Design an enzyme around this catalytic site. Structure first.
Site, PDB file in Angstrom:
ATOM      1  N   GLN A 151       0.808  -1.213   0.000  1.00 34.78           N
ATOM      2  CA  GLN A 151       0.000   0.000   0.000  1.00 34.78           C
ATOM      3  C   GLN A 151       0.845   1.268   0.000  1.00 34.78           C
ATOM      4  O   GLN A 151       0.585   2.187  -0.786  1.00 34.78           O
ATOM      5  CB  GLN A 151      -0.957   0.009   1.192  1.00 34.78           C
ATOM      6  CG  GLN A 151      -1.879   1.209   1.174  1.00 34.78           C
ATOM      7  CD  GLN A 151      -2.877   1.210   2.298  1.00 34.78           C
ATOM      8  OE1 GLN A 151      -2.878   0.324   3.152  1.00 34.78           O
ATOM      9  NE2 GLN A 151      -3.790   2.169   2.260  1.00 34.78           N
ATOM     10  N   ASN A 198       8.246   7.524   8.378  1.00 31.16           N
ATOM     11  CA  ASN A 198       7.126   8.459   8.393  1.00 31.16           C
ATOM     12  C   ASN A 198       7.305   9.569   9.423  1.00 31.16           C
ATOM     13  O   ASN A 198       6.898  10.706   9.168  1.00 31.16           O
ATOM     14  CB  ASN A 198       5.821   7.706   8.646  1.00 31.16           C
ATOM     15  CG  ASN A 198       5.420   6.831   7.476  1.00 31.16           C
ATOM     16  OD1 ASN A 198       5.175   5.636   7.638  1.00 31.16           O
ATOM     17  ND2 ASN A 198       5.361   7.420   6.288  1.00 31.16           N
ATOM     18  N   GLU A 212      -4.371  -7.064  -2.085  1.00 27.78           N
ATOM     19  CA  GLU A 212      -5.713  -6.596  -1.778  1.00 27.78           C
ATOM     20  C   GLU A 212      -6.167  -5.565  -2.810  1.00 27.78           C
ATOM     21  O   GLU A 212      -5.347  -4.790  -3.314  1.00 27.78           O
ATOM     22  CB  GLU A 212      -5.790  -5.989  -0.365  1.00 27.78           C
ATOM     23  CG  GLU A 212      -4.950  -4.740  -0.148  1.00 27.78           C
ATOM     24  CD  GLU A 212      -3.580  -5.049   0.426  1.00 27.78           C
ATOM     25  OE1 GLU A 212      -3.164  -6.226   0.379  1.00 27.78           O
ATOM     26  OE2 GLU A 212      -2.919  -4.115   0.929  1.00 27.78           O
ATOM     27  N   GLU A 268      25.044   4.300 -12.621  1.00 28.32           N
ATOM     28  CA  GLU A 268      26.019   5.321 -12.246  1.00 28.32           C
ATOM     29  C   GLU A 268      25.857   5.730 -10.789  1.00 28.32           C
ATOM     30  O   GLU A 268      26.835   5.780 -10.030  1.00 28.32           O
ATOM     31  CB  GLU A 268      25.863   6.540 -13.148  1.00 28.32           C
ATOM     32  CG  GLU A 268      27.059   7.454 -13.175  1.00 28.32           C
ATOM     33  CD  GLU A 268      27.089   8.295 -14.420  1.00 28.32           C
ATOM     34  OE1 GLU A 268      26.605   7.803 -15.458  1.00 28.32           O
ATOM     35  OE2 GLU A 268      27.581   9.442 -14.363  1.00 28.32           O
ATOM     36  N   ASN A 324       3.893  11.220   1.446  1.00 23.95           N
ATOM     37  CA  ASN A 324       4.293  10.694   0.151  1.00 23.95           C
ATOM     38  C   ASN A 324       4.692  11.806  -0.805  1.00 23.95           C
ATOM     39  O   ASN A 324       5.470  11.565  -1.725  1.00 23.95           O
ATOM     40  CB  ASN A 324       3.170   9.845  -0.447  1.00 23.95           C
ATOM     41  CG  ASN A 324       2.475   8.971   0.586  1.00 23.95           C
ATOM     42  OD1 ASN A 324       3.115   8.234   1.349  1.00 23.95           O
ATOM     43  ND2 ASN A 324       1.151   9.048   0.614  1.00 23.95           N
ATOM     44  N   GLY A 362       2.987  -6.498   4.816  1.00 29.19           N
ATOM     45  CA  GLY A 362       3.030  -7.903   4.461  1.00 29.19           C
ATOM     46  C   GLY A 362       3.210  -8.173   2.984  1.00 29.19           C
ATOM     47  O   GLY A 362       4.146  -8.877   2.586  1.00 29.19           O
TER      48      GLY A 362
END
Ligand SMILES: Nc1nc2c(ncn2[C@@H]2O[C@H](COP(=O)(O)CP(=O)(O)OP(=O)(O)O)[C@@H](O)[C@H]2O)c(=O)[nH]1
Ligand SMILES: Nc1nc2c(ncn2[C@@H]2O[C@H](COP(=O)(O)CP(=O)(O)OP(=O)(O)O)[C@@H](O)[C@H]2O)c(=O)[nH]1
Lengths: 414, 405
Positions: free
Chosen positions: A12, A203, A69, A253, A225, A141
């Site tokens: 996810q 995070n 999922e 490189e 993100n 997972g």
């Protein structure tokens, strides 16, 4: 034609980071991300063929999305439209659910042939692939399991191809899955065995980087993100823009410059400026909290740093002198005196007219993994949550081997 | 009296860019080759207006060759090779070097087979890269073994001392300088920070690589000025080899161009041979000059050139085996680059350029003992033994300079 790179996203966090990454890269090129088609009257800015393909046509990203999922793939499709090829997108039903073994021995084996058929299709459209970016969270997972399986199958079939992983670690402020240590170590073994490089995010660091240093009282994961995306855009701009003053850096490189030893291939990333859309900017790139990982790298030891400037360059001797002076008060490995790749790109990002990205190899990152290993010391001292790992197909001795491999990595760094 | 120019790598290709940008209007042509003093030594005869500079822009990960073609070269002789240069010398030598050497030497021997008479090769590259380093070394190897009677000159940009643009560039530098030794009889080394400070002194705002390569281009133009602008006291590349290379393997040169203009000639000559005007950051205080070539061009006067001996008997420090009034290869050319009524070039064989070498040695002295980046070579076909012997050769060369003081 320019050397190619495919970004396969698993899990996810990997899929959502990929969505944001191709969004910002497309709007850097001047391409609408929600459609996948180029803007009429505007040519793509830079070397599009490194990360994209003119599929007849449309400037489609070279991205492969697998997740066990449906929710994440469907959400990415909703937020991205027809940007990605549906053939590149493979989904299952039950998920892995924080279980590495589902992605490794289980539904991972079932989903592997279709993913590899699509990867062969994409690489057959590549001119010279010089890198595979695996966008994933090894705390999860599906990400851990199928990232392990996918990189192992790449190095079993291919192996002339560099592999840069971009893995999201579990946060030290809070865990999002309690089997994050299991998944992280299990995928980390295969990262050291198979992946030729690994980029590490976290995070909590991005939260503190986007809370007070973006003037947002409480950012979402979208800002998380987006910060990761600015990092990746700066990193891949070396693989994405070419010209006179700018130096083109392939992922091979960047690998040869950033990976001194075969097991020394885990990288931190940082971005400057830390302001909402020069020497103070130089130090902003190299603050103790500017890296995108919840750690303090300035008591660590920079093995080699790719400092990629991008934008107008009105102080080239002055900025080179500033970088040289800054190097004097930074922890560098003596055994790499040339530990700076000063990459330049004339074109800046969209958020800023002048940005730099730090992409460093630091021993500090190992101690980061060490705390995850410390968390691994909690789930296996009492044999917890491992019943489904054993039942899904893995073995206790295999898991001990994987943990020993992670410790081998951490001791290889220090 | 013919030159084949070899340009490998991004740095070498930008050097070539600036080199022809000034060489074309130095003979009165635009960058695209349109007519607006034997200039045929650099250029092949193709069209009455288009005098084509036959120079191979061979470079892995082409990238920049696209902006080069946007100034028209000979598109057949150049190649935009399949990318994958990295910064690995072996990757430009035997990994992807072996799948381009046949084509590039077919291009080279097709270019020299149609030559009425050749003098040598002037190759521009950077030793710190992976394409211009390894590919350049392979070209040197298979060009010396193909034409042992010809005289290869390398205009190589040595990596900067203050900051680096590659993390494996001393490996590449040393293992390319070994090939330059074993395959060429002349070499002009360029250092970037010296170019930055020279362009800071010349201009009033912050420069970039284009200004540095303009300075390098003036250097290369004045190297062959006496060969393509025949005035009095002519100079040849064979003459450069004979009177700038006192020992068989000591052919590495440092170059200064002046001025940086209706300037008085004593000032031009004293600032030509200035310790701070040379384009390679070499050791001047402990170092001495082996063989200095003063090539003056434009509005130069012979008595003016020969009477500027104050800068030689006062500032120039020579080795014990060269005469006090000697050590000068004097050259006169009737034409100078525009903006300069009279200009000067100092091409010095000097001990202090070994200092350049030793800094790379210093880096290699800390990397090889720690197994720093050598697996990138070992998995590519270049083992550690050949790297060690290449550094042994380079250290022997630097010791030869230190013994030639
Ligand atoms: N920077 C970002 N981090 C994210 C994002 N989504 C999740 N994460 C981080 O990933 C971590 C959890 O990994 P995931 O469950 O998303 C990966 P996966 O789908 O493979 O897990 P399973 O569904 O259990 O198989 C957690 O620390 C989150 O903070 C995101 O959109 N951006
Ligand atoms: N003094 C100058 N230095 C330059 C110029 N262009 C590049 N360079 C510098 O030379 C050094 C290394 O040169 P390059 O990496 O471009 C040689 P190459 O293209 O063969 O490397 P790869 O393509 O990555 O294999 C580096 O510091 C560059 O920034 C230039 O016009 N002048």
């Amino acid at each position: 034609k320019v050397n190619n790179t495919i970004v396969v996203s698993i899990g996810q966090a990997g899929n959502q980071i990929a969505a944001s990454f191709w969004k910002t890269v497309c709007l850097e090129h001047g391409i609408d991300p929600l459609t996948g088609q180029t803007a009429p009257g505007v040519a793509p800015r830079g070397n599009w063929s490194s990360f994209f393909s003119k599929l007849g046509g449309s400037y489609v990203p070279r991205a492969i999305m697998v997740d066990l999922e449906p929710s994440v793939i469907d959400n990415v499709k909703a937020t991205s439209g027809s940007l990605f090829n549906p053939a590149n997108l493979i989904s299952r039903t039950e998920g892995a659910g924080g279980n590495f073994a589902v992605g490794y021995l289980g539904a991972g084996r079932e989903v592997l042939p279709e993913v590899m058929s699509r990867l062969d299709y994409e690489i057959d459209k590549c001119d010279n692939v010089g890198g595979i970016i695996v966008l994933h969270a090894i705390g999860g997972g599906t990400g851990s399991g199928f990232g392990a399986l996918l990189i192992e199958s790449l190095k079993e079939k291919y192996g002339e191809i560099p592999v840069l992983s971009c893995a999201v670690l579990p946060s030290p402020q809070v865990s999002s899955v309690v089997t994050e240590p299991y998944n992280t170590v299990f995928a980390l073994n295969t990262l050291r065995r198979s992946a030729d490089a690994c980029l590490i995010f976290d995070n909590e660091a991005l939260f503190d980087l986007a809370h007070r240093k973006w003037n947002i009282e409480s950012p979402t994961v979208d800002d998380l993100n987006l910060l990761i995306t600015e990092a990746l855009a700066g990193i891949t701009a070396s693989m994405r823009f070419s010209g006179f003053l700018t130096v083109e850096i392939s992922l091979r490189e960047l690998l040869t410059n950033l990976v001194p030893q075969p097991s020394l291939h885990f990288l931190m990333c940082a971005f400057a400026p830390l302001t909402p859309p020069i020497e103070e900017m130089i130090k902003s790139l190299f603050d103790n909290g500017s890296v995108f990982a919840a750690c303090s790298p300035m008591e660590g030891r920079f093995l080699s740093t790719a400092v990629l400037y991008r934008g107008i360059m009105e102080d080239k001797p002055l900025a080179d002198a500033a970088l040289a002076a800054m190097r004097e008060k930074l922890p560098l490995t003596y055994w790499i005196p040339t530990a700076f790749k000063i990459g330049y790109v004339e074109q800046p990002g969209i958020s800023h007219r002048k940005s730099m990205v730090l992409l460093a190899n630091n021993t500090e990152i190992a101690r980061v993994l060490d705390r995850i290993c410390h968390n691994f010391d909690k789930l296996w001292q009492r044999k917890a949550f491992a019943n489904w790992y054993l039942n899904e197909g893995m073995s206790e001795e295999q898991i001990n081997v994987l943990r020993a491999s992670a410790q081998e990595l951490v001791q290889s760094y220090q | 009296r013919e030159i084949l120019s070899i340009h490998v790598g991004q740095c070498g290709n930008q050097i070539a860019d600036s080199f022809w940008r000034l060489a074309l209007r130095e003979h009165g042509l635009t960058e695209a080759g349109t007519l607006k003093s034997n200039m045929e030594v650099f250029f092949h005869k193709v069209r009455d207006g288009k005098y084509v500079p036959r120079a191979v822009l061979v470079d892995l990960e082409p990238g920049v060759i696209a902006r080069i073609e946007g100034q028209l070269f000979d598109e057949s002789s150049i190649v935009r090779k399949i990318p994958g240069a990295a910064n690995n010398w072996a990757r430009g030598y035997n990994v992807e070097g072996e799948k381009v050497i046949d084509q590039i030497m077919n291009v080279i021997d097709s270019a020299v087979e149609k030559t009425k008479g050749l003098q040598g090769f002037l190759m521009t590259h950077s030793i710190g890269g992976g394409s211009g380093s390894g590919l350049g070394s392979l070209i040197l190897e298979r060009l010396r073994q193909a034409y042992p009677k010809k005289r290869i000159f390398t205009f190589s940009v040595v990596p900067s001392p203050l900051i680096s643009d590659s993390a494996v560039e001393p490996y590449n530098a040393i293992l390319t300088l070994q090939r330059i030794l074993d395959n060429a009889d002349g070499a002009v080394l360029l250092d970037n920070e010296a170019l930055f400070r020279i362009a800071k002194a010349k201009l009033n705002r912050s420069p970039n690589y284009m200004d540095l390569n303009n300075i390098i281009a003036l250097i290369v133009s004045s190297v062959t000025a006496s060969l393509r602008f025949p005035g009095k006291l002519n100079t040849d590349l064979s003459e450069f080899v004979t009177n700038l290379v006192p020992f068989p393997g000591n052919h590495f040169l440092t170059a200064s161009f002046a001025p940086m203009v209706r300037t008085n000639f004593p000032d031009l000559a004293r600032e030509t041979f200035a310790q701070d005007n040379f384009t390679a950051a070499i050791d001047w205080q402990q170092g001495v000059y082996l063989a200095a070539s003063a090539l003056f061009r434009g509005d130069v006067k012979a008595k003016d050139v020969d009477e500027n001996m104050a800068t030689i008997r006062k500032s120039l420090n020579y080795a014990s085996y060269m005469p006090a009034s000697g050590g000068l290869k004097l050259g006169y050319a009737e034409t100078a680059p525009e903006g300069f009524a009279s200009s000067g070039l100092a091409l010095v064989n000097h001990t202090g350029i070994a200092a350049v070498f030793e800094r790379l040695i210093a880096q290699f002295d800390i990397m090889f003992d720690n197994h720093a980046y050598t697996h990138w070579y070992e998995n590519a076909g270049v083992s550690r033994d050949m790297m060690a012997k290449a550094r042994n050769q380079i250290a022997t060369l630097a010791q030869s300079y230190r013994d030639a003081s």
